[PDB]
Write an enzyme that holds these catalytic residues in place. Structure first.
Site, PDB file in Angstrom:
ATOM      1  N   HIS A  68      -9.136  16.684 -55.512  1.00 42.02           N
ATOM      2  CA  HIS A  68      -8.225  15.637 -54.975  1.00 42.02           C
ATOM      3  C   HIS A  68      -8.334  14.350 -55.813  1.00 42.02           C
ATOM      4  O   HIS A  68      -8.619  13.260 -55.259  1.00 42.02           O
ATOM      5  CB  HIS A  68      -8.502  15.434 -53.486  1.00 42.02           C
ATOM      6  CG  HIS A  68      -7.969  16.532 -52.646  1.00 42.02           C
ATOM      7  ND1 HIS A  68      -8.776  17.532 -52.140  1.00 42.02           N
ATOM      8  CD2 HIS A  68      -6.716  16.802 -52.235  1.00 42.02           C
ATOM      9  CE1 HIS A  68      -8.037  18.354 -51.427  1.00 42.02           C
ATOM     10  NE2 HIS A  68      -6.773  17.929 -51.477  1.00 42.02           N
ATOM     11  N   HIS A 106       0.197  10.319 -53.127  1.00 40.95           N
ATOM     12  CA  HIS A 106       0.088  11.093 -51.856  1.00 40.95           C
ATOM     13  C   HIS A 106      -1.382  11.329 -51.429  1.00 40.95           C
ATOM     14  O   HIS A 106      -1.580  11.635 -50.249  1.00 40.95           O
ATOM     15  CB  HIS A 106       0.891  12.395 -51.963  1.00 40.95           C
ATOM     16  CG  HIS A 106       0.134  13.503 -52.618  1.00 40.95           C
ATOM     17  ND1 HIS A 106       0.049  13.627 -53.985  1.00 40.95           N
ATOM     18  CD2 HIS A 106      -0.591  14.515 -52.088  1.00 40.95           C
ATOM     19  CE1 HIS A 106      -0.684  14.695 -54.269  1.00 40.95           C
ATOM     20  NE2 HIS A 106      -1.104  15.250 -53.115  1.00 40.95           N
ATOM     21  N   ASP A 107      -2.365  11.250 -52.334  1.00 43.32           N
ATOM     22  CA  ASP A 107      -3.801  11.562 -52.035  1.00 43.32           C
ATOM     23  C   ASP A 107      -4.703  10.374 -52.431  1.00 43.32           C
ATOM     24  O   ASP A 107      -5.885  10.588 -52.679  1.00 43.32           O
ATOM     25  CB  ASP A 107      -4.296  12.827 -52.750  1.00 43.32           C
ATOM     26  CG  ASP A 107      -4.105  14.115 -51.977  1.00 43.32           C
ATOM     27  OD1 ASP A 107      -3.977  14.057 -50.754  1.00 43.32           O
ATOM     28  OD2 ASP A 107      -4.104  15.179 -52.617  1.00 43.32           O
ATOM     29  N   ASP A 217       2.620  19.876 -53.630  1.00 48.39           N
ATOM     30  CA  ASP A 217       1.187  19.698 -53.300  1.00 48.39           C
ATOM     31  C   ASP A 217       0.422  20.990 -53.577  1.00 48.39           C
ATOM     32  O   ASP A 217      -0.749  20.896 -53.991  1.00 48.39           O
ATOM     33  CB  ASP A 217       0.989  19.241 -51.855  1.00 48.39           C
ATOM     34  CG  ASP A 217      -0.353  18.568 -51.633  1.00 48.39           C
ATOM     35  OD1 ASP A 217      -1.002  18.172 -52.632  1.00 48.39           O
ATOM     36  OD2 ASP A 217      -0.728  18.422 -50.468  1.00 48.39           O
ATOM     37  N   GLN A 269      -7.827  33.998 -50.509  1.00 47.15           N
ATOM     38  CA  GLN A 269      -6.598  33.587 -51.249  1.00 47.15           C
ATOM     39  C   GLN A 269      -5.407  34.463 -50.827  1.00 47.15           C
ATOM     40  O   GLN A 269      -4.280  33.931 -50.803  1.00 47.15           O
ATOM     41  CB  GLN A 269      -6.809  33.629 -52.771  1.00 47.15           C
ATOM     42  CG  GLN A 269      -7.685  32.493 -53.297  1.00 47.15           C
ATOM     43  CD  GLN A 269      -7.015  31.151 -53.127  1.00 47.15           C
ATOM     44  OE1 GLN A 269      -6.085  30.808 -53.852  1.00 47.15           O
ATOM     45  NE2 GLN A 269      -7.439  30.402 -52.119  1.00 47.15           N
TER      46      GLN A 269
HETATM   47  C1  LIG Z   1      -7.303  21.885 -47.944  1.00 50.64           C
HETATM   48  C2  LIG Z   1      -6.077  21.564 -48.759  1.00 50.64           C
HETATM   49  C3  LIG Z   1      -4.984  22.555 -48.424  1.00 50.64           C
HETATM   50  C4  LIG Z   1      -4.605  23.336 -49.665  1.00 50.64           C
HETATM   51  O1  LIG Z   1      -5.360  24.585 -49.650  1.00 50.64           O
HETATM   52  C5  LIG Z   1      -5.222  25.412 -50.768  1.00 50.64           C
HETATM   53  C6  LIG Z   1      -4.411  25.173 -51.888  1.00 50.64           C
HETATM   54  N1  LIG Z   1      -4.289  25.986 -52.940  1.00 50.64           N
HETATM   55  C7  LIG Z   1      -5.096  27.128 -52.899  1.00 50.64           C
HETATM   56  N2  LIG Z   1      -5.082  28.077 -53.977  1.00 50.64           N
HETATM   57  N3  LIG Z   1      -5.967  27.428 -51.844  1.00 50.64           N
HETATM   58  C8  LIG Z   1      -6.015  26.602 -50.803  1.00 50.64           C
HETATM   59  O2  LIG Z   1      -6.827  26.919 -49.736  1.00 50.64           O
HETATM   60  C9  LIG Z   1      -7.036  28.355 -49.615  1.00 50.64           C
HETATM   61  C10 LIG Z   1      -8.331  28.670 -48.873  1.00 50.64           C
HETATM   62 MG   LIG Z   2      -3.578  15.325 -49.156  1.00 54.25          MG
HETATM   63 ZN   LIG Z   3      -2.541  16.724 -52.512  1.00 49.13          ZN
END
Ligand SMILES: CCCCOc1cnc(N)nc1OCC
Ligand SMILES: [Mg+2]
Ligand SMILES: [Zn+2]
EC number: 3.1.4.17
Length: 313
Positions: A68, A106-107, A217, A269
């Site tokens: 992040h 955004h973060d 995002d 995943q």
């Molecule tokens: C906590 C932020 C939410 C975005 O979560 C993800 C984004 N991209 C991938 N590849 N995996 C994620 O979580 C999967 C366990």
């Molecule tokens: Mg965020």
């Molecule tokens: Zn983000």
């Protein structure tokens, strides 16, 4: 005024593509963003002096966290650039101004912990903002940097236009709260199916903008497999840190944040691509057909995770 940002030939071409990776050279990221603003919005949308100052105050207020971080900000902004560029006539002047700035911001000041861990830790921010905790904070940080002397990149907008753009940026940032996406996409799926979807309806535009924000995002799942895979390491580095801190609160974390349960990551995943990513880019491609390349890239990466589980890699 006649000062244009020009990139090297490989970037000038690759940047127009959904799967573009902004590279490991941090000092090129500001110019890449300004280049995207100049071609998405115009060389006039912003005073280059104030935008540059803005960009660098925004960079300073991202932290040194595995995922992040400032790179995530420019990466999410780049996904929005490609969506906007492939949908030239659907978005207003104020939306194309707002949405890139919305994505870069955004973060802001993310510590690498979810809204859950803020509430269990009983962080002050969880008393200030009961829902969408970090996202209300991110938006607050954007206002504060816009309010530094010499940083108001919208100064040249009318009172109404200014409140219009702040409103777009606020909803855009709040929409990055993944807990809100599920109902946003369901509603959008119903409206598109029953034919009730109308982009002259502001409530409806708001929802489409929210889904674009989720799409941008999450865009690490729409890159080439080597980028998607190496980015996943950064994502889980934060999750495992948060699980360590959950254990320090005397709460066993969910297996996704337990660094003892790394073997469960590939299956982790699949669930995420099926439950979150594929649906997200499916509805997006339904509402904005030219963003189909994101669903295709997402489907390929779903295949790559399947092949990992099946021990082929
Ligand atoms: C906590 C932020 C939410 C975005 O979560 C993800 C984004 N991209 C991938 N590849 N995996 C994620 O979580 C999967 C366990
Ligand atoms: Mg965020
Ligand atoms: Zn983000």
């Amino acid at each position: 005024g006649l000062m244009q940002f020009t990139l090297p030939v490989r970037l000038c071409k690759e940047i127009e593509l959904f799967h573009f990776d902004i590279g490991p050279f941090e000092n090129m990221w500001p110019g890449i963003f300004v280049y995207m603003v100049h071609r998405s919005c115009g060389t006039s949308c912003f005073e280059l002096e104030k935008l540059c100052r803005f960009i660098m105050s925004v960079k300073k207020n991202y932290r040194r966290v595995p995922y992040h971080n400032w790179k995530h900000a420019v990466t999410v902004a780049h996904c929005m650039y490609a969506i906007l560029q492939n949908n030239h006539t659907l978005f207003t002047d104020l939306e194309r101004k707002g949405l890139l700035i919305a994505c870069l911001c955004h973060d802001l000041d993310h510590r690498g912990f979810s809204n859950s861990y803020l509430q269990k830790f009983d962080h002050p921010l969880a008393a200030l903002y009961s829902t969408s905790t970090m996202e209300q904070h991110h938006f607050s940080q954007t206002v504060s940097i816009l309010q530094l002397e010499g940083h108001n990149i919208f100064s040249t907008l009318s009172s109404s236009e200014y409140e219009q753009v702040l409103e777009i940026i606020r909803k855009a940032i709040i929409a990055t709260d993944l807990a809100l996406y599920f109902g946003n996409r369901k509603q959008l799926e119903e409206m598109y199916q029953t034919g009730s979807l109308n982009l002259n309806n502001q409530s409806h535009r708001d929802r489409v903008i929210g889904l674009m924000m989720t799409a941008c995002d999450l865009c690490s799942v729409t890159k080439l497999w080597p980028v998607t895979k190496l980015t996943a390491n950064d994502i889980y580095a934060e999750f495992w840190a948060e699980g360590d801190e959950m254990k320090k609160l005397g709460i066993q974390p969910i297996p996704m944040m337990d660094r003892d349960k790394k073997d469960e990551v590939p299956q982790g995943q699949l669930g995420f691509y099926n439950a979150v990513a594929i649906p997200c880019y499916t509805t997006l491609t339904q509402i904005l057909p030219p963003t189909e390349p994101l669903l295709k890239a997402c489907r390929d990466n779903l295949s790559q995770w399947e092949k990992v589980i099946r021990g082929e890699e």
